[PDB]
């Protein structure tokens, strides 16, 4: 449609705002991980629960390095 591509513009707008907040804090996440984290946080999840995982998976790639 046309109004269905305007909503596909309004999601890129949000994703750019979130991409700005991700860099001015200098997080560890990149844009590709962040697209999974937005899907998780849309469902309703403890953000205290995901961060402990992400704190272990980043040290599990120092168990790969």
């Amino acid at each position: 449609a046309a109004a269905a591509a305007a909503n596909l513009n309004a999601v890129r707008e949000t994703m750019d705002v979130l991409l700005e907040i991700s860099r001015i804090l200098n997080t560890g996440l990149d844009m590709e991980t962040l697209s999974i984290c937005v899907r998780l946080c849309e469902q309703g999840i403890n953000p205290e629960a995901l961060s402990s995982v992400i704190k272990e998976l980043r040290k599990a790639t120092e168990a790969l390095k």
Partner: peptide, 23 residues
């Protein structure tokens, strides 16, 4: 899925009639 569809070609023109969703 949304970020996969999100890479669509979008016009670089922005409307002068609409500031609310100008694609």
């Amino acid at each position: 899925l949304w970020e996969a569809a999100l890479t669509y070609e979008a016009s670089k023109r922005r409307c002068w009639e609409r500031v609310g969703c100008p694609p």
